[PDB]
Amino acid sequence: MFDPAEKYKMDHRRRGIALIFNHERFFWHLTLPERRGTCADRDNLTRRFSDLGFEVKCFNDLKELLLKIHEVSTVSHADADCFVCVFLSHGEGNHIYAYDAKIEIQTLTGLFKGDKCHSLVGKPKIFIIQACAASVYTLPAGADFLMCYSVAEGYYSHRETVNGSWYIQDLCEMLGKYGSSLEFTELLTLVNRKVSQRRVDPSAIGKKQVPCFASMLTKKLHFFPKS
Amino acid sequence: KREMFDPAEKYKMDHRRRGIALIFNHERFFWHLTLPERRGTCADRDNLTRRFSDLGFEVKCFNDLKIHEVSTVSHADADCFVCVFLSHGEGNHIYAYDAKIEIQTLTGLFKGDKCHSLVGKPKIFIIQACAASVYTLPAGADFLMCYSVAEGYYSHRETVNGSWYIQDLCEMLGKYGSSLEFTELLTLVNRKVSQRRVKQVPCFASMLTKKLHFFPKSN
Amino acid sequence: MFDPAEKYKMDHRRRGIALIFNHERFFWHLTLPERRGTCADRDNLTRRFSDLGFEVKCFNDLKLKIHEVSTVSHADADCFVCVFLSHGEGNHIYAYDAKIEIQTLTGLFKGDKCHSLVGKPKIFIIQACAASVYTLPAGADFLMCYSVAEGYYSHRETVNGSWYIQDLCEMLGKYGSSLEFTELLTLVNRKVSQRRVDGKKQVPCFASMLTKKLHFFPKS
Amino acid sequence: EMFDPAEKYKMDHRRRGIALIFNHERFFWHLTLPERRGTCADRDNLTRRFSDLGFEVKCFNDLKELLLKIHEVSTVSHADADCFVCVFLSHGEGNHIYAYDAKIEIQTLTGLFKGDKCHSLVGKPKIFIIQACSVYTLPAGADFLMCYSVAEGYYSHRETVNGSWYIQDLCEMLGKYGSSLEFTELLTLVNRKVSQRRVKKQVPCFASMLTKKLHFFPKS
Ligand SMILES: [Zn+2]
Ligand SMILES: [Zn+2]
Ligand SMILES: [Zn+2]
Ligand SMILES: [Zn+2]
């Protein structure tokens, strides 16, 4: 009967797809601090999710543009544990850039809701979002969903340095150190502390960046080593 | 530099008191009402009170038909702050609007900038979901926002025995209240309510920095 | 398939029996600091397990009800808990008798002999003072919690009690339902050794032959 | 908080420490080849898993003089090292002299690294993994972990080409959950795996005198 510490089954053939999405659609102009900085985020996330047993796919949204997104949402995951989708964005941006991102996040999360994605029903769906038609909010829907945000609704966000961004650097450091050792919600709480304590001051306030994860998960999530 | 980063740091629960578990039942602009819902909301309030009193809380509940002293009085002797927001399932467009305004102004009082005593201390707001800043999203560090319903999902109607989300919250708080870290506790409420599709999907938004454990006190 | 954090089931009707056994045989002219020095351990430990949902049965050797403990059905019970209590300064007969009493208690509840407790954790909390004079015995799902290891120097009971039982009960109130039981004993191992008031440090031990993790989540 | 509830041993020191593999090859006359290498597959399996954890593996036998590089192990500074790991290996079917010699070899190894004798490892966990075949199974010491292949009342495995089930599954757990789980939780998995791999059931044991939790997070 009822178990106070039930975990999602991690004994499926593969761990699944860690989709990485860097929002570059309507951004101009760009600089090498941010360019290689976003690269540093993407390169760092890839190696960390590859370590946890994920099949990493990343596509830029400037480039069949939706067909590369269909095959991911359309292909079966019955052999997989979970789905991870990382959304990367630029700190600075025009009003349109930030608008398209909110539309992309909305349509991207909607594809993996139980009504459309049969294979991932009862399986955790983690969307890691870098925050930057009247339904304009940072809140989507779905059961067994994990929404990870770099910034809480009204807070200040990092500018992307050459080495990357505050939220991503810290996420990868914790994923590298405790990725298979901790339940993922405890893991994100460490990212919550590390980023908020890292209130450092380059046009400072100084305002602190407060991350937030919205959890609709039903069980404990653990990325125990596979194979 | 005596003891560095700890992967499992918990909020200090060795303060004189555990704190105040404020209960708030939104009744301001609701008409008309029925005994299924009336004694049902009572069942929620009566059930939460006994469960938080078990965990060592000083419970205060006030109807909004009749707040500073709670947000203004010092909590330097306390572990944390809990605020439960109760609402009626059915409601006019104004009723649901006032609730969103109350939640906004209530959470804003305990943000670090105003509440000095609760800085570095967990603030848990359990919300029963029912001027352009109209959203279910407030702000603050070390904040725990517990929602009965995710943004677009269906919510229970309040039976005589109470509501789905609250009944399950109290059952888990009675069984594992001092035994589990509170986020693991809420995940059990997330499963129990969603499986009880007789779907309502709960969601907790966590801005906490440490592990939260309501270990028994007074020793 | 590979059960990584597999725990013993804790959903059965009753949690089980807390069996407190105080060694009161061949201890001639026992002092009062040990007399209801021990009471404060018995009445402290009979509270903490009862707070965990155990049925506490206290009986002394000073006074056939022993076969009535093993004979009962545990098919609806989670675990067996038997805490063994004794006084510090005793003659060699008191020391010898205790060893044989742990043989019969421990050998009585070996899965092959007691079939109702098979697969169900048996925690023996020992307070220590044939050609088989040894500290360790055998058994699957067995947990042997020793007050102090070999090469040991034992505490003297005062008007609360013994540091091991003192801090053991203390951990059961603070982390009994919240932590895995082996993690709880690790805290006792640190607490009792650090509570080295006056000149050595008492090093306690627990022997684990457990197959699964152990958590005392409140029943029902 | 003052009360350290999930306190772990520090794992931030320069080097993790030494993995000391000791294979008992004395007074084992006419050893069969299935035991010969055999044991190699255990030594070359365990020398990989600890080295994968950041340990420096030193393999030396008693067959070789073997007693004088032994003082060179305890004498080294551990002030920059996290732990001491010493895995003790032996073959199954041996004469009474082979059984007697092993017991005394565990005395000197265990007594050599008692905190009072080795001061550089004080407060730092000492994990002794024993493979078994003052004559007793248990010794003393703080921050000491005695991992036994099988408890008393035991029936030991016979080494084949791969090796011994305990070392087989021990290494297996170190690859799957070595860096991911607390070390006592890892042994609990070994305790279940080896007993269930009963192709009676071999019941292994670990004695814990540890004050803190133990996790092998990858260094730096
Ligand atoms: Zn876990
Ligand atoms: Zn805890
Ligand atoms: Zn536990
Ligand atoms: Zn750990």
> Is C126 in CB contact (< 8 Å) with chain D?
no
**Which alpha helices (DSSP H) does chain D contain, by range?**
33-36, 40-49, 71-74, 96-112, 165-176, 183-196
* Helix/strand/coil for C70: helix
Q: Which one, of B108, B92, B93, B107, lies nearest residue B32 by Cα?
A: B92
Question: Which residues touch A80 (CB under 8 Å, ≥6 apart)?
Answer: A12, A13, A14, A15, A16, A17, A119, A120, A123
Please state whether the peptide bond connecting residue B32 to the residue before it is cis, i.e. omega within 30 degrees of 0.
yes
> Is B216 in CB contact (< 8 Å) with chain C?
yes
Known catalytic residues of A are 90, 132
> Is B211 in CB contact (< 8 Å) with chain C?
no
CA of D169 to the centre of ligand 4 (A): 21
Pick the residue of A123, A188, A198, A215 with the most B CBs within 10 A to test the interface with B by mutation: A215
* Catalytic-labelled residue, pool D13, D40, D133, D215: D133
Q: Is B216 in Cβ contact with C173 (below 8 Å)?
A: yes
Domain boundaries, chain A: 1-227
User: Do B219 and C176 form a contact (C-beta atoms < 8 A)?
Assistant: no
> Is A227 in CB contact (< 8 Å) with chain C?
no
* Catalytic-labelled residue, pool B80, B83, B115, B130: B130
Chain B CA closest to residue A181: B7
- DSSP lists the bridge partners of residue B86 as B25
B residues 138-197 lying closer than 8 A (beta carbon) to C = 175-176, 178-180
Measure B166 CA to nearest chain C CA, in Å.
18
Q: Which one, of D142, D83, D108, lies nearest residue D22 by Cα?
A: D108
Please state whether the peptide bond connecting residue D30 to the residue before it is cis, i.e. omega within 30 degrees of 0.
no
Q: Which one, of C168, C159, C173, C161, lies nearest residue C204 by Cα?
A: C168
Active site (annotated) includes residue C87: yes
The experimental method, as deposited, was X-ray
* Helix/strand/coil for D130: strand
Residue A161, phi then psi, degrees to nearest 5: -80, 175
**Which alpha helices (DSSP H) does chain A contain, by range?**
32-51, 67-74, 95-110, 166-178, 184-197
> Is D123 in CB contact (< 8 Å) with chain A?
no
Segment holding C106, helix H or strand E: helix C92-108
Q: How far apart are CA C125 and CA C8, in angstroms?
A: 19
Q: Which numbered ligand comes closest to the C-alpha of A183?
A: 1
Say which of B4, B12, B213 has its CB closest to residue D12.
B4
CA of C186 to the centre of ligand 2 (A): 14
Active site (annotated) includes residue B130: yes
Measure A143 CA to nearest chain C CA, in Å.
25
- Per CATH, domain A1-227 is 3.40.50.1460: yes
Distance of CA A189 to the CA centre of its chain: 15
User: Do A225 and A53 form a contact (C-beta atoms < 8 A)?
Assistant: yes
The pair of three-digit structure tokens given for residue C48, joined into one six-digit string: 């903490």
Instruction: Tell me the CA distances in angstroms from B218 to B13, B178, B200, C216, one per residue in order.
Output: 11, 13, 38, 21
The pair of three-digit structure tokens given for residue C131, joined into one six-digit string: 């050609």
Cα-based torsion angle of the residue sequence C87, C89, C95, C98 in order, rounded to the nearest 10 degrees: 0
Q: Which residue has the tokens 């709670």?
A: B70
Instruction: Tell me the CA distances in angstroms from C137 to B169, C98, C202, C208, D136, one per residue in order.
Output: 44, 14, 22, 11, 11
Q: Is D180 in Cβ contact with A225 (below 8 Å)?
A: yes
Instruction: Tell me the CA distances in angstroms from D73 to C202, D21, D85, one per residue in order.
Output: 27, 12, 11
Q: How far apart are CA B68 and CA B180, in angstroms?
A: 32
Q: Which one, of C11, C16, C33, lies nearest residue C87 by Cα?
A: C33
Residue type, C104: T
The pair of three-digit structure tokens given for residue A19, joined into one six-digit string: 């989709």
Q: Which residues from chain D sit within 8 angstroms of residue A181, using beta carbons?
A: 179-181, 215, 217
The CATH fold assigned to D1-220 is Rossmann fold (3.40.50)
Q: Which numbered ligand comes closest to the C-alpha of C214?
A: 3
CA of A180 to the centre of ligand 1 (A): 9
Please state whether the peptide bond connecting residue C53 to the residue before it is cis, i.e. omega within 30 degrees of 0.
no
Q: Is C213 in Cβ contact with D189 (below 8 Å)?
A: no
CATH class of B1-219: alpha beta
Q: Which residues from chain B sit within 8 angstroms of residue D185, using beta carbons?
A: none
Measure B126 CA to nearest chain A CA, in Å.
14
Q: Which numbered ligand comes closest to the C-alpha of A181?
A: 4
Segment holding D17, helix H or strand E: strand D15-23
SS in 3 state form for chain B?
A: CCCCCCCCCECCCCCCEEEEEEEEECCCCCCCCCHHHHHHHHHHHHHHHHHHHHCCCEEEECCCCCCHHHHHCCCCCEEEEEEEEECCCCCCHHHHHHHHHHHHHHHHCCCCCCCCCCCCCCEEEEECCCCCCCCCCCCCCCEEEEECCCCCCCCCCCECCECHHHHHHHHHHHHHCCCCEHHHHHHHHHHHHHHCCCCCCCEEEECCCCECECCCCCC
Segment holding C92, helix H or strand E: helix C92-108
Resolution in A: 2.8
CA of C54 to the centre of ligand 1 (A): 26
> Is D213 in CB contact (< 8 Å) with chain A?
no
Q: Is A185 in Cβ contact with B187 (below 8 Å)?
A: yes
